[PDB]
Amino acid sequence: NNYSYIDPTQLPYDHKWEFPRNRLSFGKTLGAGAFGKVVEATAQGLIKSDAAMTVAVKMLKPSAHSTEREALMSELKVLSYLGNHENIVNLLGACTHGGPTLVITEYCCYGDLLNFLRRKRDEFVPYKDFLTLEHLLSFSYQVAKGMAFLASKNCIHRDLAARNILLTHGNITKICDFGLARDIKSNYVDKGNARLPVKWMAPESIFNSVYTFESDVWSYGIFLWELFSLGSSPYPGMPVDSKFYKMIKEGFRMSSPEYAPAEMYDIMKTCWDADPDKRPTFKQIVQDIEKQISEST
Ligand SMILES: CCN[C@@](C)(c1ccc(F)cc1)c1cnc(N2CCN(c3ncnn4cc(-c5cnn(C)c5)cc34)CC2)nc1
Protein backbone atom coordinates (compact mmCIF):
# COMPACT_ATOMS: atom_id res chain seq x y z
CA ASN A 1 0.00 0.00 0.00
CA ASN A 2 2.21 2.80 -1.34
CA TYR A 3 -0.76 5.14 -1.94
CA SER A 4 -3.19 6.13 0.80
CA TYR A 5 -5.83 8.72 1.64
CA ILE A 6 -4.40 11.51 3.80
CA ASP A 7 -6.46 11.67 7.03
CA PRO A 8 -6.85 15.38 7.89
CA THR A 9 -7.15 14.58 11.60
CA GLN A 10 -3.73 12.86 11.57
CA LEU A 11 -1.91 15.92 10.20
CA PRO A 12 -0.01 18.23 12.56
CA TYR A 13 -1.66 21.39 13.83
CA ASP A 14 -0.48 24.27 11.62
CA HIS A 15 0.75 27.15 13.78
CA LYS A 16 -0.17 29.63 11.07
CA TRP A 17 -3.50 29.65 12.97
CA GLU A 18 -2.00 30.42 16.38
CA PHE A 19 -3.30 33.48 18.21
CA PRO A 20 -2.29 34.80 21.66
CA ARG A 21 -4.75 33.79 24.38
CA ASN A 22 -4.13 37.09 26.20
CA ARG A 23 -5.57 39.05 23.27
CA LEU A 24 -8.98 37.32 23.51
CA SER A 25 -11.62 38.90 25.76
CA PHE A 26 -14.66 36.68 26.44
CA GLY A 27 -18.19 38.07 26.33
CA LYS A 28 -21.64 36.47 26.21
CA THR A 29 -22.12 32.71 26.08
CA LEU A 30 -23.66 31.76 22.74
CA GLY A 31 -24.24 28.08 23.48
CA ALA A 32 -23.44 25.66 26.26
CA GLY A 33 -23.60 21.98 27.14
CA ALA A 34 -22.34 19.34 29.56
CA PHE A 35 -18.61 19.75 28.85
CA GLY A 36 -18.28 22.80 26.59
CA LYS A 37 -19.45 26.22 25.51
CA VAL A 38 -19.08 28.74 22.70
CA VAL A 39 -18.71 32.41 23.61
CA GLU A 40 -18.63 35.70 21.80
CA ALA A 41 -15.23 37.37 22.15
CA THR A 42 -13.12 40.29 20.97
CA ALA A 43 -9.87 39.35 19.21
CA GLN A 44 -7.36 42.20 19.37
CA GLY A 45 -5.13 42.34 16.31
CA LEU A 46 -6.53 39.22 14.67
CA ILE A 47 -7.14 40.73 11.21
CA LYS A 48 -6.57 44.50 11.42
CA SER A 49 -3.24 45.28 13.10
CA ASP A 50 -4.76 48.07 15.24
CA ALA A 51 -8.44 47.10 15.54
CA ALA A 52 -10.54 44.52 17.37
CA MET A 53 -12.80 41.97 15.72
CA THR A 54 -15.80 40.17 17.19
CA VAL A 55 -15.36 36.37 16.92
CA ALA A 56 -16.77 33.17 18.39
CA VAL A 57 -14.61 30.89 20.56
CA LYS A 58 -15.28 27.19 21.19
CA MET A 59 -13.82 25.70 24.39
CA LEU A 60 -14.31 22.86 26.85
CA LYS A 61 -15.15 23.11 30.51
CA PRO A 62 -12.34 22.39 33.01
CA SER A 63 -13.99 19.06 33.88
CA ALA A 64 -13.91 17.75 30.30
CA HIS A 65 -12.40 14.31 29.76
CA SER A 66 -9.58 13.47 27.37
CA THR A 67 -12.00 12.10 24.76
CA GLU A 68 -13.71 15.48 24.48
CA ARG A 69 -10.38 17.32 24.31
CA GLU A 70 -9.15 15.13 21.45
CA ALA A 71 -12.47 15.66 19.65
CA LEU A 72 -12.05 19.44 19.81
CA MET A 73 -8.53 19.25 18.35
CA SER A 74 -9.84 16.93 15.62
CA GLU A 75 -12.51 19.51 14.70
CA LEU A 76 -9.82 22.21 14.48
CA LYS A 77 -7.82 20.01 12.09
CA VAL A 78 -10.89 19.26 9.92
CA LEU A 79 -11.63 22.99 9.69
CA SER A 80 -7.97 23.70 8.86
CA TYR A 81 -8.11 21.18 6.01
CA LEU A 82 -11.49 22.23 4.59
CA GLY A 83 -10.45 25.77 3.71
CA ASN A 84 -12.66 28.81 3.39
CA HIS A 85 -16.19 29.11 2.00
CA GLU A 86 -18.82 31.85 2.15
CA ASN A 87 -21.56 29.52 3.46
CA ILE A 88 -19.69 27.92 6.36
CA VAL A 89 -18.64 29.43 9.69
CA ASN A 90 -14.96 29.79 8.88
CA LEU A 91 -11.95 29.09 11.06
CA LEU A 92 -10.04 32.25 11.99
CA GLY A 93 -7.47 31.02 14.50
CA ALA A 94 -6.70 28.88 17.50
CA CYS A 95 -4.98 28.95 20.89
CA THR A 96 -3.09 25.73 21.66
CA HIS A 97 -0.14 26.48 23.89
CA GLY A 98 -0.31 28.00 27.34
CA GLY A 99 -3.60 26.24 28.11
CA PRO A 100 -6.56 24.27 26.73
CA THR A 101 -7.53 24.37 23.06
CA LEU A 102 -9.58 27.37 21.94
CA VAL A 103 -11.01 27.40 18.42
CA ILE A 104 -11.73 30.89 17.01
CA THR A 105 -14.40 31.14 14.28
CA GLU A 106 -16.41 33.82 12.51
CA TYR A 107 -19.19 35.40 14.59
CA CYS A 108 -22.69 35.47 13.01
CA CYS A 109 -24.60 38.42 14.38
CA TYR A 110 -28.20 37.17 13.93
CA GLY A 111 -27.82 33.76 15.56
CA ASP A 112 -29.28 30.45 14.50
CA LEU A 113 -31.86 30.18 11.75
CA LEU A 114 -34.37 28.13 13.76
CA ASN A 115 -34.86 30.83 16.39
CA PHE A 116 -34.79 33.48 13.67
CA LEU A 117 -37.64 31.79 11.79
CA ARG A 118 -39.70 31.37 14.96
CA ARG A 119 -39.16 35.09 15.71
CA LYS A 120 -40.17 36.09 12.17
CA ARG A 121 -43.09 33.67 11.86
CA ASP A 122 -45.80 36.20 12.72
CA GLU A 123 -44.32 38.85 10.40
CA PHE A 124 -43.81 36.61 7.35
CA VAL A 125 -45.48 37.39 4.02
CA PRO A 126 -44.87 35.23 0.91
CA TYR A 127 -44.55 38.28 -1.39
CA LYS A 128 -43.40 41.79 -0.44
CA ASP A 129 -38.15 44.16 7.45
CA PHE A 130 -40.39 41.17 6.69
CA LEU A 131 -39.38 37.63 5.80
CA THR A 132 -40.61 36.45 2.37
CA LEU A 133 -40.52 33.45 0.05
CA GLU A 134 -37.55 34.94 -1.80
CA HIS A 135 -35.57 34.86 1.48
CA LEU A 136 -36.48 31.23 2.17
CA LEU A 137 -35.43 30.20 -1.35
CA SER A 138 -32.14 32.07 -0.84
CA PHE A 139 -31.48 30.28 2.46
CA SER A 140 -32.19 26.90 0.82
CA TYR A 141 -29.70 27.73 -1.97
CA GLN A 142 -26.93 28.99 0.32
CA VAL A 143 -27.13 25.95 2.63
CA ALA A 144 -27.03 23.69 -0.45
CA LYS A 145 -23.90 25.50 -1.72
CA GLY A 146 -22.18 25.15 1.66
CA MET A 147 -23.00 21.43 1.73
CA ALA A 148 -21.88 20.94 -1.87
CA PHE A 149 -18.56 22.48 -0.79
CA LEU A 150 -18.24 20.05 2.15
CA ALA A 151 -19.01 17.07 -0.07
CA SER A 152 -16.50 18.30 -2.65
CA LYS A 153 -13.90 18.01 0.12
CA ASN A 154 -15.13 14.45 0.92
CA CYS A 155 -16.61 15.53 4.25
CA ILE A 156 -19.92 14.89 5.99
CA HIS A 157 -21.41 17.09 8.71
CA ARG A 158 -23.73 14.58 10.52
CA ASP A 159 -25.84 17.23 12.34
CA LEU A 160 -27.40 19.34 9.60
CA ALA A 161 -30.49 21.13 10.97
CA ALA A 162 -31.86 24.67 11.14
CA ARG A 163 -30.37 25.03 14.65
CA ASN A 164 -26.90 24.55 13.06
CA ILE A 165 -27.34 27.22 10.37
CA LEU A 166 -26.42 30.76 11.39
CA LEU A 167 -27.36 34.09 9.82
CA THR A 168 -25.01 37.05 9.48
CA HIS A 169 -24.86 40.36 7.63
CA GLY A 170 -26.34 40.53 4.16
CA ASN A 171 -28.72 37.60 4.67
CA ILE A 172 -25.77 35.22 4.31
CA THR A 173 -26.32 31.83 5.96
CA LYS A 174 -23.44 29.74 7.30
CA ILE A 175 -23.30 26.12 8.44
CA CYS A 176 -21.84 25.81 11.97
CA ASP A 177 -20.73 23.19 14.54
CA PHE A 178 -18.31 20.77 12.90
CA GLY A 179 -17.88 18.72 16.07
CA LEU A 180 -19.16 15.57 14.38
CA ALA A 181 -17.91 16.31 10.85
CA ARG A 182 -15.81 13.55 9.28
CA ASP A 183 -13.66 13.01 6.22
CA ILE A 184 -14.90 9.71 4.86
CA LYS A 185 -11.93 8.71 2.64
CA SER A 186 -17.13 5.57 1.49
CA ASN A 187 -19.05 5.91 4.76
CA TYR A 188 -18.61 6.37 8.49
CA VAL A 189 -19.80 3.92 11.17
CA ASP A 190 -20.42 5.65 14.49
CA LYS A 191 -19.35 3.51 17.46
CA GLY A 192 -20.20 6.22 20.01
CA ASN A 193 -22.65 6.43 22.90
CA ALA A 194 -24.12 9.92 22.59
CA ARG A 195 -27.60 11.39 22.32
CA LEU A 196 -28.55 11.64 18.67
CA PRO A 197 -30.78 13.98 16.61
CA VAL A 198 -33.16 11.15 15.74
CA LYS A 199 -35.76 13.15 13.82
CA TRP A 200 -33.07 14.49 11.40
CA MET A 201 -31.39 11.11 10.77
CA ALA A 202 -31.60 8.86 7.72
CA PRO A 203 -33.07 5.40 8.48
CA GLU A 204 -29.77 3.72 7.71
CA SER A 205 -28.06 5.96 10.30
CA ILE A 206 -30.64 5.05 12.96
CA PHE A 207 -30.74 1.34 12.19
CA ASN A 208 -27.10 0.66 11.24
CA SER A 209 -25.12 3.71 12.52
CA VAL A 210 -24.01 4.32 8.89
CA TYR A 211 -23.31 7.92 7.76
CA THR A 212 -22.61 9.01 4.17
CA PHE A 213 -22.91 11.88 1.69
CA GLU A 214 -26.45 10.59 1.17
CA SER A 215 -27.43 10.74 4.87
CA ASP A 216 -26.38 14.40 4.97
CA VAL A 217 -28.79 14.86 2.03
CA TRP A 218 -31.61 13.26 4.05
CA SER A 219 -30.97 15.77 6.86
CA TYR A 220 -31.02 18.62 4.33
CA GLY A 221 -34.51 17.47 3.34
CA ILE A 222 -35.57 17.74 6.99
CA PHE A 223 -33.95 21.20 7.15
CA LEU A 224 -36.04 22.28 4.16
CA TRP A 225 -39.19 21.19 6.00
CA GLU A 226 -38.14 23.26 9.04
CA LEU A 227 -37.37 26.21 6.78
CA PHE A 228 -40.63 26.33 4.85
CA SER A 229 -42.69 25.55 7.97
CA LEU A 230 -41.16 28.68 9.55
CA GLY A 231 -39.43 26.71 12.29
CA SER A 232 -41.88 23.96 13.25
CA SER A 233 -40.43 20.90 14.93
CA PRO A 234 -40.36 17.91 12.56
CA TYR A 235 -42.90 15.10 12.79
CA PRO A 236 -45.28 17.14 14.98
CA GLY A 237 -47.17 15.14 17.57
CA MET A 238 -44.92 12.09 17.20
CA PRO A 239 -42.73 10.95 20.11
CA VAL A 240 -39.52 9.11 19.29
CA ASP A 241 -40.68 5.58 20.18
CA SER A 242 -41.11 2.20 18.51
CA LYS A 243 -44.05 3.51 16.46
CA PHE A 244 -41.89 6.30 15.02
CA TYR A 245 -39.15 3.95 13.83
CA LYS A 246 -41.68 1.51 12.35
CA MET A 247 -43.46 4.29 10.44
CA ILE A 248 -40.22 5.70 8.98
CA LYS A 249 -39.08 2.24 7.92
CA GLU A 250 -42.45 1.50 6.22
CA GLY A 251 -42.17 4.71 4.19
CA PHE A 252 -44.04 7.38 6.12
CA ARG A 253 -42.87 10.91 5.27
CA MET A 254 -43.92 14.38 6.35
CA SER A 255 -46.41 16.27 4.20
CA SER A 256 -45.54 19.56 2.51
CA PRO A 257 -45.41 22.70 4.62
CA GLU A 258 -48.09 25.14 3.53
CA TYR A 259 -45.64 27.72 2.14
CA ALA A 260 -43.20 25.33 0.45
CA PRO A 261 -43.14 25.73 -3.35
CA ALA A 262 -44.16 22.43 -4.95
CA GLU A 263 -40.72 22.14 -6.57
CA MET A 264 -39.08 22.47 -3.15
CA TYR A 265 -41.35 19.79 -1.67
CA ASP A 266 -40.25 17.67 -4.66
CA ILE A 267 -36.61 18.06 -3.52
CA MET A 268 -37.64 17.11 0.04
CA LYS A 269 -39.27 13.88 -1.13
CA THR A 270 -36.20 12.81 -3.12
CA CYS A 271 -33.91 13.62 -0.17
CA TRP A 272 -36.02 11.15 1.83
CA ASP A 273 -35.84 8.22 -0.58
CA ALA A 274 -35.52 4.97 1.39
CA ASP A 275 -32.78 4.05 -1.13
CA PRO A 276 -29.72 6.31 -0.56
CA ASP A 277 -28.68 5.82 -4.21
CA LYS A 278 -31.84 7.57 -5.43
CA ARG A 279 -31.33 10.74 -3.37
CA PRO A 280 -29.96 13.79 -5.26
CA THR A 281 -26.44 15.07 -4.66
CA PHE A 282 -25.87 18.54 -3.24
CA LYS A 283 -24.41 19.52 -6.62
CA GLN A 284 -27.72 18.53 -8.24
CA ILE A 285 -29.73 20.34 -5.55
CA VAL A 286 -27.78 23.58 -6.16
CA GLN A 287 -28.46 23.39 -9.92
CA ASP A 288 -32.16 22.71 -9.26
CA ILE A 289 -32.62 25.62 -6.84
CA GLU A 290 -30.62 27.96 -9.08
CA LYS A 291 -33.14 27.38 -11.86
CA GLN A 292 -36.03 28.02 -9.47
CA ILE A 293 -34.50 31.34 -8.40
CA SER A 294 -33.87 32.41 -12.00
CA GLU A 295 -37.42 31.51 -13.03
CA SER A 296 -38.73 33.43 -10.00
CA THR A 297 -37.17 36.67 -11.29
C1 LIG B 1 -23.48 19.94 20.40
C2 LIG B 1 -23.24 21.15 21.34
N1 LIG B 1 -21.82 21.21 21.67
C3 LIG B 1 -21.41 22.42 22.35
C4 LIG B 1 -22.18 22.51 23.66
C5 LIG B 1 -19.89 22.35 22.57
C6 LIG B 1 -19.18 23.52 22.88
C7 LIG B 1 -17.81 23.46 23.07
C8 LIG B 1 -17.14 22.25 22.95
F1 LIG B 1 -15.79 22.22 23.12
C9 LIG B 1 -17.84 21.08 22.64
C10 LIG B 1 -19.22 21.14 22.45
C11 LIG B 1 -21.76 23.61 21.44
C12 LIG B 1 -22.57 24.65 21.89
N2 LIG B 1 -22.85 25.65 21.04
C13 LIG B 1 -22.39 25.63 19.79
N3 LIG B 1 -22.76 26.73 18.92
C14 LIG B 1 -23.33 27.98 19.43
C15 LIG B 1 -23.63 28.93 18.29
N4 LIG B 1 -22.40 29.16 17.60
C16 LIG B 1 -22.10 30.46 17.02
N5 LIG B 1 -21.00 30.50 16.28
C17 LIG B 1 -20.61 31.65 15.67
N6 LIG B 1 -21.37 32.75 15.83
N7 LIG B 1 -22.50 32.72 16.61
C18 LIG B 1 -23.40 33.76 16.86
C19 LIG B 1 -24.39 33.26 17.65
C20 LIG B 1 -25.57 34.10 18.19
C21 LIG B 1 -26.54 33.68 19.09
N8 LIG B 1 -27.36 34.74 19.27
N9 LIG B 1 -26.90 35.78 18.51
C22 LIG B 1 -27.54 37.11 18.43
C23 LIG B 1 -25.82 35.42 17.85
C24 LIG B 1 -24.11 31.93 17.88
C25 LIG B 1 -22.91 31.62 17.19
C26 LIG B 1 -21.81 28.02 16.92
C27 LIG B 1 -22.21 26.69 17.56
N10 LIG B 1 -21.63 24.66 19.34
C28 LIG B 1 -21.27 23.65 20.12
Author numbering: 566 to 693, 762 to 818, 821 to 932
Can you list sentences taken from the study reporting this PDB entry?
To our delight, we were able to obtain co-crystal structures at high resolutions for each of the inhibitors 8-12 bound to KIT-wt (1.5–2.0 Å) and 9 bound to PDGFRA-T674I (2.6 Å). A single modification by ethylation did not affect the potency significantly since the IC50 values were almost the same as for avapritinib. However, a reduction between 1.7- and 3.5-fold in potency was observed in the cellular experiments. A comparison of the obtained crystal structures indicated that the ethyl residue displaced one water molecule in the complex with KIT-wt. Yet, there were no other significant alterations in the complexes of KIT-wt and PDGFRA-T674I bound to 9 when compared to the complex structures bound to avapritinib, respectively. Lower inhibitory activity was observed in KIT cell lines for both alkylated derivatives 8 and 9 compared to PDGFRA cell lines.
Avapritinib is the only potent and selective inhibitor approved for the treatment of D842V-mutant gastrointestinal stromal tumors (GIST), the most common primary mutation of the platelet-derived growth factor receptor α (PDGFRA). Against this background, we solve the crystal structures of avapritinib in complex with wild-type and mutant PDGFRA and stem cell factor receptor (KIT), which provide evidence and understanding of inhibitor binding and lead to the identification of a sub-pocket (Gα-pocket). Furthermore, we report the identification of a sub-pocket (Gα-pocket) located in the N-lobe of the kinase domain, which is surrounded by amino acids of key regulatory elements such as the Gly-rich loop and the αC-helix.
